[PDB]
Amino acid sequence: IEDHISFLEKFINDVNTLTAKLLKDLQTEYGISAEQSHVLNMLSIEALTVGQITEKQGVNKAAVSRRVKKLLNAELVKLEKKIIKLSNKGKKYIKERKAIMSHIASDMTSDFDSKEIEKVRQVLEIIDYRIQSYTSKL
Amino acid sequence: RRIEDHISFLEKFINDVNTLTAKLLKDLQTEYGISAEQSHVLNMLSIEALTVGQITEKQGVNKAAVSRRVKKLLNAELVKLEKKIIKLSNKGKKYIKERKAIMSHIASDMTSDFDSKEIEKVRQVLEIIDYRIQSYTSKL
């Protein structure tokens, strides 16, 4: 009933704990820190302004600037005419990120029935839609 | 390309959950006067009690701040210490009630039109995957 809300909070805390560990090597190699990639993670999807990044994060604007800048500076993020995209060097990062997510996601979904995963992704697309429809409303 | 579709979705999914929980809790974290990060640090205590180290990589984001924001919790006097594990206030639970409360006033009103076999199967699948993930972790 709402053991769901906890499970979710726990499911998400575990994919973050795990993601971080598998990405530690790739992050130091790039000098980029976790939140910096985690922003490299948001911008993978769409081209935000530093303001849009804070609101979509709950954190202190100041730190979003610490990060946004250290990034451009690193030529990983490529500002556009303040709407920022992903520098082509920041692309090769993302390629190497899903390259690892995948060798573990499949390693844990060897035995699954896609015809079964299908239906849950349908349910998660609808909840997702409903959650996005709240991005709005104020 | 191939199965990257399902995780890219899973990530776009967590993202929105984070974005929303964030938005839906400002007015509330602001009303208790705490940051989000010292709140995340606060939901992990509604479970049990935590050590500065117990959270370090277990949170992901390092270990420095673990104390820096633990102290303002200590000091804003709404999360109790232990020896280096830490429990919760008991007027901090008051808050977590306020949190858990409003997060449902909305999540059910966001999933109420399904009935069961539907949702239970998503849960069952995320559970196995959560089982997998954890077993797979196993490290410092």
Residue numbers in the entry:
A (entry chain B): 5 to 85, 95 to 151
B (entry chain A): 3 to 85, 95 to 151
From the study:
The production of PIA depends on the expression of the icaADBC operon, and TcaR and IcaR are a weak and a strong negative regulator of transcription of the ica locus, respectively. As the MarR-type proteins can act as positive, negative, or bifunctional regulators, TcaR also acts as a multi-functional regulator. The overall structure of each monomer could be divided into two functional domains, one is the dimerization domain and the other is the winged helix-turn-helix (wHTH) DNA binding domain. In addition, the wHTH DNA binding domain is composed of α2-α3-α4-βA-W1-βB which adopts the winged-helix-fold, and the amino acid sequences of this domain are highly conserved.
In the present study, we found that TcaR could interact with ssDNA and the result demonstrated that TcaR shows a stronger preference toward GC-rich ssDNA than to dsDNA by using EMSA, CD, and Biacore experiments. To clarify whether the ssDNA binding site of TcaR is close, or identical, to the dsDNA binding site, a TcaR quadruple mutant (4 positively charged amino acids responsible for DNA binding mutated to alanines to produce R71A/K73A/R93A/K95A) was designed and its ssDNA and dsDNA binding ability tested. The mutant failed to interact with either dsDNA or ssDNA. This indicated that these amino acids are essential for binding in both ssDNA and dsDNA. Interestingly, the association rate of GC33 ssDNA is two-times higher than IcaR DNA1, but the dissociation rate of IcaR DNA1 is the lowest compared to the DNA fragments tested in this study, suggesting different modes of interaction occurs in ssDNA-TcaR and dsDNA-TcaR complex. Taken together, we demonstrate that TcaR shows a higher binding affinity to ssDNA than to dsDNA, and several antibiotics could regulate the ssDNA binding activity of TcaR. M13-based in vitro DNA replication assay showed that the addition of TcaR protein to the reaction mixture, and incubation for up to 30 min, resulted in almost no DNA replication activity compared to controls. This indicated that TcaR markedly inhibits DNA replication and that the mechanism of inhibition, at least in part, involves interaction with viral ssDNA. The observed biological differences point to a remarkable plasticity of TcaR. These findings, thus, may support a hypothesis that TcaR might interfere with viral ssDNA replication and establish a link between TcaR and ssDNA phage resistance.
